[PDB]
Symmetry: none
Subunit: 32 residues, 16 copies
Amino acid sequence: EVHHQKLVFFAEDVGSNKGAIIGLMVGGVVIA
Amino acid sequence: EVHHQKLVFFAEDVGSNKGAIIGLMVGGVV
Amino acid sequence: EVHHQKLVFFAEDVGSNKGAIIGLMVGGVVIA
Amino acid sequence: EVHHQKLVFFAEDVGSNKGAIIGLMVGGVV
Amino acid sequence: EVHHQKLVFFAEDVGSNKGAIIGLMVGGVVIA
Amino acid sequence: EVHHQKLVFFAEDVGSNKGAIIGLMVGGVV
Amino acid sequence: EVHHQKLVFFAEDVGSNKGAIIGLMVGGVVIA
Amino acid sequence: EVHHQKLVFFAEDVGSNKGAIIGLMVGGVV
Amino acid sequence: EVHHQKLVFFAEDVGSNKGAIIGLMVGGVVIA
Amino acid sequence: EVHHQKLVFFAEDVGSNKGAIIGLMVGGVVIA
Amino acid sequence: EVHHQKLVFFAEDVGSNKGAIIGLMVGGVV
Amino acid sequence: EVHHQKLVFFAEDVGSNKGAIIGLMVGGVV
Amino acid sequence: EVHHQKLVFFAEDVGSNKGAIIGLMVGGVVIA
Amino acid sequence: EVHHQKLVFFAEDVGSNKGAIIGLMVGGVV
Amino acid sequence: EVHHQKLVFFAEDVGSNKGAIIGLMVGGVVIA
Amino acid sequence: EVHHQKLVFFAEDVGSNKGAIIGLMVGGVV
């Protein structure tokens, strides 16, 4: 089947927003 | 044959926003 | 066959907007 | 066989604007 | 087949506008 | 086979417009 | 086959006009 | 078909006049 | 602090002159 | 502190020149 | 100091003359 | 504290040239 | 503190050059 | 305090070169 | 100590060069 | 603090020059 990628991230604030470190490293290898 | 690549981030501030570290690294070889 | 890449980022600040560090690096390699 | 590339960013303010750091660097080598 | 790229950025300044940093660097190469 | 390239920015001001720093550098070589 | 490039920039100034930094440097070359 | 290149900038005028810094350096050669 | 950009392109034609496709689209903007 | 970028590409055509595809898309952004 | 921008193209001429395609669209504005 | 970025590619021919596909897309968001 | 990034690719063809598919995608994200 | 990022590829042809798939995806967040 | 990264790949031919699929996916995450 | 940006391409011809397809699109926004 064809590649289906879904990445959902939620980051809500209710007083003092800061922000954390979020790193998404996606790697794919294949022939042709 | 559809390649559905959906990347969504939901950020909502209520008091005072600062700044998050969002790093999206997508690498593909064919 | 049909590439559908969609990146949607929501940044709704109701208090004081600052500035987040977002880096979108997508790399594709394919033999023509 | 269409290449649908949609990049949408929603930046809303209701108090004070500053300056976010968003970098979109995509590389496609065919 | 056919490339359809759509970049949409929303900036709703309601308080006191300033200025954000947005870099759009799309690199595409193909052998003709 | 129309290469649809739409680049749209919506900057609104109802307080005190200033100056956003946006750089659009699309590079394509066939 | 045919390039349909459209750049639309909306800048409101209901509060007070100023001056945004908008750099439009798109480069497209094809072998002849 | 014909190359449909459209560059449009819409600036409002309600507050104190000033001037935006736009650099339209689009390069397209075959 | 000071931009020192230099583009040097060497193209020899000892066999037969033709026509290379060189696209120079550098964009540099700074907030004022 | 200070950026020093140097891109050097060597193309020594001795047989029969044609044309290669080389895309240099450097994207750099920074809050001032 | 002063902005040192240098653009030099050195094309030789030994065989049959023709003509290269150079698109110099450098955009720099503050 | 210098940021040294050196990118060098050596393409040598002694028979017949064609056309390689090299794409260098780097993104630095500070 | 001092970044030293060097990418050196060697491609010496003594027979018949064709065309390899090389994609260099480096992404860096850091809070200013 | 030096970040030595050295990436080297040695491709040598003797008869007839074709085209290898070289994909380097380096992503780092801090 | 400071990050020292060294990647060396050899690909030599002696008759009929082809080329294999080599994908290097490096990912690093850290705070500030 | 001089921003050294050196872009140099060495294209030689001793057989029969044609046309390389090179696209240099550097985007920098401060």
